[PDB]
Design a protein around this ligand. Structure first.
Ligand SMILES: *[C@@H]1O[C@H](CO)[C@@H](O[C@@H]2O[C@H](CO)[C@@H](O[C@@H]3O[C@H](CO[C@H]4O[C@H](CO[C@H]5O[C@H](CO)[C@@H](O)[C@H](O)[C@@H]5O[C@H]5O[C@H](CO)[C@@H](O)[C@H](O)[C@@H]5O)[C@@H](O)[C@H](O[C@H]5O[C@H](CO)[C@@H](O)[C@H](O)[C@@H]5O[C@H]5O[C@H](CO)[C@@H](O)[C@H](O)[C@@H]5O)[C@@H]4O)[C@@H](O)[C@H](O[C@H]4O[C@H](CO)[C@@H](O)[C@H](O)[C@@H]4O[C@H]4O[C@H](CO)[C@@H](O)[C@H](O)[C@@H]4O)[C@@H]3O)[C@H](O)[C@H]2NC(C)=O)[C@H](O)[C@H]1NC(C)=O
Ligand SMILES: *[C@@H]1O[C@H](CO)[C@@H](O[C@@H]2O[C@H](CO)[C@@H](O[C@@H]3O[C@H](CO[C@H]4O[C@H](CO)[C@@H](O)[C@H](O)[C@@H]4O)[C@@H](O)[C@H](O[C@H]4O[C@H](CO)[C@@H](O)[C@H](O)[C@@H]4O[C@H]4O[C@H](CO)[C@@H](O)[C@H](O)[C@@H]4O[C@H]4O[C@H](CO)[C@@H](O)[C@H](O)[C@@H]4O)[C@@H]3O)[C@H](O)[C@H]2NC(C)=O)[C@H](O)[C@H]1NC(C)=O
Ligand SMILES: *[C@@H]1O[C@H](CO)[C@@H](O[C@@H]2O[C@H](CO)[C@@H](O[C@@H]3O[C@H](CO[C@H]4O[C@H](CO[C@H]5O[C@H](CO)[C@@H](O)[C@H](O)[C@@H]5O[C@H]5O[C@H](CO)[C@@H](O)[C@H](O)[C@@H]5O)[C@@H](O)[C@H](O)[C@@H]4O)[C@@H](O)[C@H](O[C@H]4O[C@H](CO)[C@@H](O)[C@H](O)[C@@H]4O)[C@@H]3O)[C@H](O)[C@H]2NC(C)=O)[C@H](O)[C@H]1NC(C)=O
Ligand SMILES: *[C@@H]1O[C@H](CO)[C@@H](O[C@@H]2O[C@H](CO)[C@@H](O[C@@H]3O[C@H](CO[C@H]4O[C@H](CO)[C@@H](O)[C@H](O)[C@@H]4O)[C@@H](O)[C@H](O[C@H]4O[C@H](CO)[C@@H](O)[C@H](O)[C@@H]4O[C@H]4O[C@H](CO)[C@@H](O)[C@H](O)[C@@H]4O)[C@@H]3O)[C@H](O)[C@H]2NC(C)=O)[C@H](O)[C@H]1NC(C)=O
Ligand SMILES: *[C@@H]1O[C@H](CO)[C@@H](O)[C@H](O)[C@H]1NC(C)=O
Ligand SMILES: *[C@@H]1O[C@H](CO)[C@@H](O)[C@H](O)[C@H]1NC(C)=O
Lengths: 834, 832
């Protein structure tokens, strides 16, 4: 079975780069803390004990409030009077770094104004190994360059607004099936441990880790480690991914929190690089914790060195100061668990003072404008045979499909969005937010037609095909709406257990399209979905005149779409994934049956880097719509490619420090006047008897044997060749080549172009092309601009597993510029650089 | 069994009153016609043979295009690019003669522009005997005064726009069950003839006939006779209702057409006063007619006098010229039977030239404005505990109920609106039109909340009570939507065969309301429905803060409603029927089971005039919301009642116009291709018996022709006739009544003052409406409302005299804001 080699000790923070000041503040305050106060920072107080989906007790003596951590990557979860933004996948489809940053800033403002200190997002894991993976839509794209850049921009927007971002899920959580043992048991599968992603060192560097390097370099405060194992070591105690790749190689200076239920040991996780246990207990409301009391005990008995617990506290305070949270701090002014104004302070056991728990604070500002704009700018025009924009003069408009209409239970009427009813503007699970309202395509399109005194109707029952065909025969245009949904694995809709069982349109969508196209020669298809779907049955029908993919647009969905359909916005989005003729074309099958008896299912990533377009290109398959494809209401020309060569670090760490002092066990015993709330997790001991206060059946059992070599080594360490900076050795970001090309609007309408720069790194098992740069450029008709970008040393390297470093290989490299991964009219060889 | 006495001969037209010019023109043209041309004007060409739901073949030699007759009373049926107006009952709720007129005008203009010559509406029969009758919503109100005025105004609006209006259904078709033998058989009942409404003579005159007297007097060009029998004589051959009451007593100068399938004999119906057979065949596409060939033969063989068929033709032409149709004529530019651009010219057999059958003419103009305004002005505010108008600043708004949302089959996705899915804006049957779109209350209210940056959602599954209760707990205001639907008897929705099985809200509506009101202290209920529903389970719940009934508002439903909820329109509508505590409180039960063996079920109107509020008042019952009740966002005061007393006997002989020749002049013209199922006026040969094909031809003919039926001599003028809508002395103004009305609140809006009389006597209702108006007043403004009582208004029908008499019992007048809120009252002076 795959095996995860040890890497110890767990690197200590050092004030690297832009963390100098936050680190000095953190050391100064942690140096004042007792051991129990430090432990409080690292451990949540139990599921549903306080207001936020994760919450720590904070350090009241030093006026540090409990940290409130709240989902989701697209808007505040489980709250009120908040906005519901488009999903991460729509941000990918914009190809627009500025919109990514502005959506991060608008979310950070809302989370800040609710008294939330840490936003649980954004997401770049799953990256998107499989097109049917249940959570790809929360992240960005299966391409690491596109994802890393928009991931980083989103982080900077949230943290500039004063909230810590959490880069998740770290790492290789590429499918929902078998991700948690009790979830799997619920679905009838008996496994002893969760699915193991087994992946080689070059692929993890070149694909899945890459956006995390960009997140670290962009200054992300927190990372959330994942439910799956990696080579049979759980993501929240994997010393290789946490200590070696994230902390020593990427130089991460912030803190690592568990996913909820992803914490699986006290000592082992602390030594392997975990910094924060969420929601704090071992299982929800177990009234036990791997940390809390156990972690205080593990320091007192000598098993976890004081320097490791002090380092967890320093990384957590440093991230909090780095974004300035101390300057915006207020307790969370809502409850995740009830919308009542008043209630008991500690929700789950219904204890504590009875007081106000919701303040109904409206934090939306005018964030509907950026939502509406980002929905329009993420609507990919896949096909258009001179059918769009509509003019408003269409005499009779048929709006066809459940996906145009309202959810009959209300927009929020399925818990955690766990149904696919009405228009799909948000997929399901914890990566969700309550809509303040949802504008449906039916509403926005009917309103548009009425403003023009047209005739218009909506049919939203996709087995009402008699009515559909009769109306389509009468209509000037039939706008047909179809979807395909997915979400986190704890919810199953129609047997889809988070992951999609297929890539086919849900609710009879292929048959609805055929019924309309059979009868109307101007049938336009709009798809809302979490990822690609199969369009082969109808995309080339002679009466399917246009096809758009609008993703999961959030609360302004119908307006975003009407702006594009009626030409107020010229669509500039480009597909952030491949649209294949079949499911087999994408390869990368999910693991859906037990393949390791009743042990952890094994998920070998045997395709290596060959996911999405890299796989299609390697197998010489032709997508229907390739990665980077999107049409516009204007045309653009690329000309004049030029390349210019440009003229372009500690070897050991310090010893591990300690901050403040640890005293006797009696200093950490529960304080005499404190009422202990049922199920609440505390840092304190029942008595000075360590074994009895731990309640651990394995307390003191063969301890040395279970402490890996190097795990308590506080001496100076070697800096790895690929380490020593933020996101990797700083030499990786030297700029080696400047590339320029002229882009011109050759059409009659102002529009944005998304020029794309791919490289071919050369060599027998490298992808033919890999994206490296892009931008989104607004041009008036006939306007030209010179698009200039640079390739860094990292952009031209491959990961060399013998060197443990990035290397520019001797194969000749080329650059290619154009409008998609398959439309690259300009190509230049690159000169040898190093 | 009840018996319907004869009245013959059928009165001939005489250019009475405003008909003088149209009649001279009609006599001039009919005098040029051959007998087969006259018969073409009287007989439809067969079900689905041409474009319109009814169509005659016209007289092409004299450039008279076939007459196209089209439903419905609320917009053009079976067409495209037309509007869908609010139903008649919503016009009754406006209490607004001017809106009634303007809705008539806007409809007439659309029908005219499609090449439609005759609109099959408006309706005042059913009047509304039973609250669960399936078609009462097509007409106006169970009160004859209110219905008669708005019925007439609607007629005037249609006909001033150049379309003949058809006052229907004449008369006593007060329920759907048992109205047609073949429908009853489809619903599992075996009856030999249709339901018989049995009604005494005073009740018919004071209630059901009275709005048709107003329609006649208003100049209505056509009447459609009904499918029921009256005292066991079918409506479309009832000589007492057609010849005596409509033609001799009310003086009607226009034409009577059958309802579709209500024609039941050729000679019998022609002599008892029918003038037009629709859709022209005996059963649909039977290729046989009681008229057509048979009527040409009935004149040739002497059984039907030429004067009778000449008078049919004169009545039909005179109505056509009275509204000026000749100056607006064009063939119908759409097909009722297909939306395709091209098709065979004669749809049912797919014969004739293959050519354009639809022109897609968009006749809507700006008529969405009158529809939006009429919906707002027909929204009755029944209850308002200081909750309305909303301001737009409510932070979270819950829109609850299927009746707020979209029909998932599309607004026209149930044929003839035969389902209750989504918001109810039109009830079902042939009294319908295709919506050009339908603005739902979900759409309009969510749009209004988003304009103010509020939060808002709609729940539209009325069994999703978990979600309802959760959302109602979080909401500032919960707007709950509920409905009850009904329709013409050939469609059954959820086992309601036209008529309503009960008066309870459909789709879980009572439970929906209680789920919201249990959880939200500002729960406002909006009801869309064809008539009253029972509200006793929740109307006095302390968290139900306002209740509105919006009727069947047509295409602008959500916008009409948001204008009232949000205070752009101050509601002025008043209830045009009673809201009782139970179904029993209304009495007047439908006949739901066979009560005469397998013969015609018998429907005795044994309550006499005591329908709706007159029955509540006679039983001393207290309605929840009485007839004439409706609130406003301002208050009004009524004061200052002042009362002031104010200062032919034979017809001509029946004429004939033009000549009738030998049978051979009427045989099918040799070069004509006879279209399958098409009804023609011609004979196969000069052999009359063989050309008729009638198994009864020539047998016992005289014993089957009632006495007087061929008498063309001058006739006595009835004491109660001699004018239009009755003897002109009926309309002398006898008493003037004035009151002062003041707006004492802070919002401009309309008052609906109501004047009731008490005619006195042991058998008379305590109060009956006679006059009303809708008066617009700004805050603090006052006006004097002056009206008059006619001799008719103070009379009762005396069966011995066969005339209206003002009885000796002392009479009183009552003026106020509803049938139960009448603070002003006085004795009336004796007048005669
Ligand atoms: C001071 O106070 C402290 C706080 O109170 C006290 O702390 C207690 O110390 C105890 C030891 O004294 C701890 O108990 C022992 O824990 C270990 C670790 O278990 C966790 O990690 C497992 C994987 O371990 C590898 O990786 C981690 C880092 O991730 C390293 O830390 C490990 O050293 C180890 O490293 C090797 O492998 C990696 C690659 O994976 C390499 O890179 C390295 O180089 C090394 O080669 C993981 O598998 C465990 O998962 C189990 O438990 C989860 C829930 O906790 C559960 O979800 C999982 O499904 C799984 O459940 C199965 O096992 C558990 C018991 O562990 C059963 O209860 C359960 O029923 C299932 O069977 C976990 O996340 C654990 O390995 C030890 O148990 C082995 O050894 C004991 C005997 O010593 C055997 O009885 C056990 O069966 C078990 O045996 C397996 O391993 C043997 C070799 O180790 C092998 O010989 C056997 O054949 C067998 O298969 C102990 O349980 C305790 O966790 C800790 N408490 C707290 C609160 O932190 C401290 O004692 C006190 N100090 C003093 C001086 O008093
Ligand atoms: C009661 O109402 C009903 C319903 O409205 C009335 O019935 C309608 O009556 C119309 C007559 O008013 C009759 O019209 C015939 O339509 C025929 C079909 O027309 C369509 O197809 C043709 C041919 O492809 C197209 O050209 C045309 O535009 C239409 O699309 C026409 O073929 C008939 O035209 C003939 O008569 C008219 C005058 O009526 C002449 O102007 C015209 O030139 C045609 O004349 C030829 O045929 C006639 C028939 O006798 C001869 O008299 C004449 O001399 C010509 O003869 C030459 O041609 C014929 C064959 O072409 C050939 O055999 C011969 O040897 C010669 O060479 C006419 O227009 C409607 O069809 C009819 N509707 C239905 C459903 O039946 C009814 O009249 C009303 N009754 C009363 C008493 O008012
Ligand atoms: C007056 O005249 C009126 C008009 O003719 C008469 O009205 C009819 O009354 C009938 C008798 O009551 C009605 O027929 C009843 O209809 C009930 C509702 O059926 C509809 O809803 C259910 C429930 O839907 C929820 O569940 C579905 C899945 O279970 C789900 O898809 C749906 O979305 C809803 O979800 C919510 O609820 C679930 C939890 O349940 C949640 O999980 C979810 O989150 C949401 O919260 C549905 O199953 C059904 O298909 C239909 O869509 C049926 O429930 C009744 O059937 C029950 O009772 C029967 C006995 O009557 C029995 O056979 C059966 O086993 C059940 O126990 C029943 O059919 C009829 O609809 C009314 N018609 C109209 C037009 O309103 C009225 O009766 C007359 N009154 C008098 C006094 O004469
Ligand atoms: C790890 O993180 C956890 C979680 O944040 C944190 O636990 C919390 O510690 C705080 C600070 O110690 C605890 O605060 C206590 O709150 C109780 C209850 O306060 C509410 O209810 C009361 C009663 O209705 C209100 O009056 C009050 O305003 C609050 O609404 C307080 O009563 C405590 O303060 C008083 O009593 C304390 C007992 O805990 C006394 O010890 C204290 O000195 C105060 O004295 C006054 O009240 C006394 C009792 O009535 C009276 O005898 C005195 O004479 C005097 O009048 C205190 O503020 C909070 O409960 C903990 N939360 C939970 C869930 O247990 C850990 O401290 C943190 N650990 C570390 C090491 O940092
Ligand atoms: C600690 O003390 C509490 C209260 O007596 C008890 O419920 C709990 O079980 C004890 N914890 C341990 C680990 O024994
Ligand atoms: C008239 O002649 C037609 C055509 O021959 C024939 O079908 C029809 O039955 C005849 N009509 C009657 C009443 O005999």
């Amino acid at each position: 079975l795959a095996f995860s080699p040890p890497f110890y000790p767990s690197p200590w923070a050092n004030g690297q780069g832009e963390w100098a000041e936050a680190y000095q503040r953190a050391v100064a305050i942690v140096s004042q803390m007792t051991l129990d106060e430090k432990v409080n920072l690292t451990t949540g107080t139990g599921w549903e004990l306080e207001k936020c989906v994760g919450q720590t007790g904070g350090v009241p003596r030093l006026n540090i409030g409990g940290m409130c951590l709240q989902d989701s990557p697209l808007g505040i979860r489980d709250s009120d009077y908040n906005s519901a933004f488009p999903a991460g996948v729509n941000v990918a489809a914009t190809w627009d770094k500025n919109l990514a940053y502005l959506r991060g800033q608008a979310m950070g403002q809302e989370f800040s104004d609710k008294g939330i200190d840490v936003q649980l997002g954004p997401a770049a894991g799953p990256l998107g190994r499989s097109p049917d993976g249940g959570r790809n839509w929360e992240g960005f794209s299966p391409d690491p360059a596109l994802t890393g850049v928009l991931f980083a921009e989103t982080i900077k927007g949230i943290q500039d607004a004063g909230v810590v971002a959490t880069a998740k899920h770290y790492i290789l959580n590429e499918q929902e099936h078998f991700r948690q043992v009790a979830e799997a048991a619920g679905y009838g599968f008996n496994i002893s441990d969760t699915i193991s992603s087994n992946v080689d060192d070059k692929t993890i560097h070149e694909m899945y880790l890459w956006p995390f390097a960009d997140a670290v370099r962009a200054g992300v405060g927190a990372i959330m480690c994942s439910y799956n194992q990696i080579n049979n070591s759980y993501g929240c105690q994997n010393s290789y991914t946490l200590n070696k790749l994230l902390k020593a190689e990427l130089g991460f200076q912030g803190f690592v929190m568990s996913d909820w239920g992803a914490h699986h040991s006290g000592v082992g996780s602390a030594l392997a690089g975990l910094d924060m246990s969420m929601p704090g207990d071992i299982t929800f409301d177990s009234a036990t914790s791997f940390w809390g009391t156990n972690l205080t005990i593990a320091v007192l008995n000598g098993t976890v060195p004081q320097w490791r617990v002090d380092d967890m506290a320093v990384r957590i305070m440093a991230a909090y100061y780095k974004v300035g949270r101390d300057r915006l701090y207020q307790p969370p002014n809502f409850s995740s668990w009830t919308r009542d104004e008043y209630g008991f302070k500690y929700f789950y056991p219904q204890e504590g003072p009875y007081e106000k728990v919701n303040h109904f604070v409206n934090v939306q500002r005018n964030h509907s404008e950026v939502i509406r704009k980002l929905g329009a700018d993420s609507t990919v025009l896949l096909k258009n045979n001179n059918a769009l924009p509509l003019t408003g003069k269409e005499r009779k408009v048929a709006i066809l499909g459940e996906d145009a209409g309202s959810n009959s239970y209300g927009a929020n009427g399925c818990s955690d969005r766990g149904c696919d009813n009405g228009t799909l503007a948000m997929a399901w699970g914890s990566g969700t937010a309550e809509f303040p309202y949802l504008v449906t395509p039916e509403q926005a399109i009917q309103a548009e037609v009425l403003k023009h005194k047209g005739s218009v109707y909506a049919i939203t029952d996709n087995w009402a095909l008699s009515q559909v065909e009769t109306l389509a025969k009468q209509a000037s245009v039939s706008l047909v709406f179809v979807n395909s949904d997915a979400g986190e694995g704890y919810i199953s809709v129609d047997g889809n257990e988070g992951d999609r069982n297929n890539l086919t349109l849900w609710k009879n969508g292929d048959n609805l399209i055929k019924a309309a196209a059979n009868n109307c020669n101007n049938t336009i298809v709009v798809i809302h979905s979490v990822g690609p779907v199969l369009v082969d049955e109808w995309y080339d029908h002679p009466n399917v005149t246009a096809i758009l993919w609008a993703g999961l647009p959030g609360q302004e969905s119908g307006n975003s779409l009407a702006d594009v359909l009626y030409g107020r916005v010229n669509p500039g989005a480009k597909s952030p994934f491949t649209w294949g003729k079949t499911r087999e074309a994408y390869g990368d099958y999910l693991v859906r049956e037990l393949n390791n008896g009743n042990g952890a299912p094994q998920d070998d990533f045997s395709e290596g880097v060959f996911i999405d377009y890299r796989g299609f290109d390697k197998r010489n398959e032709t997508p229907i719509y390739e990665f980077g494809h999107g049409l516009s209401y204007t045309t653009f020309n690329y000309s004049g490619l030029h390349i210019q060569v440009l003229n372009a670090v500690a070897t050991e760490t310090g010893a591990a420090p300690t901050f403040g002092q640890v005293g006797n066990a009696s200093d950490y015993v529960y304080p005499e006047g404190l009422t202990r709330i049922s199920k609440f997790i505390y840092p304190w001991l029942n008595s000075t008897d360590l074994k009895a206060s731990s309640g651990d059946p394995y307390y003191g059992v063969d301890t040395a044997e279970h402490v890996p070599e190097g795990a308590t080594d506080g001496s100076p360490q070697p800096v790895l060749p690929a380490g020593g900076g933020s996101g990797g050795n700083p030499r990786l970001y030297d700029e080696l080549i400047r590339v320029s090309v002229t882009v011109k609007n050759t059409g009659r309408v102002a529009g944005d172009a998304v020029p794309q720069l791919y490289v071919s790194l050369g060599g027998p098992n490298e992808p033919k092309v890999v994206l490296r740069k892009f931008d989104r450029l607004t041009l008036k008709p006939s306007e030209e601009t010179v698009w200039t970008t640079t390739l860094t040393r990292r952009d031209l390297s491959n990961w060399d597993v013998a060197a443990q470093d990035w290397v520019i290989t001797s194969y000749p490299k080329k650059v290619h510029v154009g409008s998609s991964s398959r439309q690259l009219p300009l190509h230049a060889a690159l000169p040898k650089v190093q």
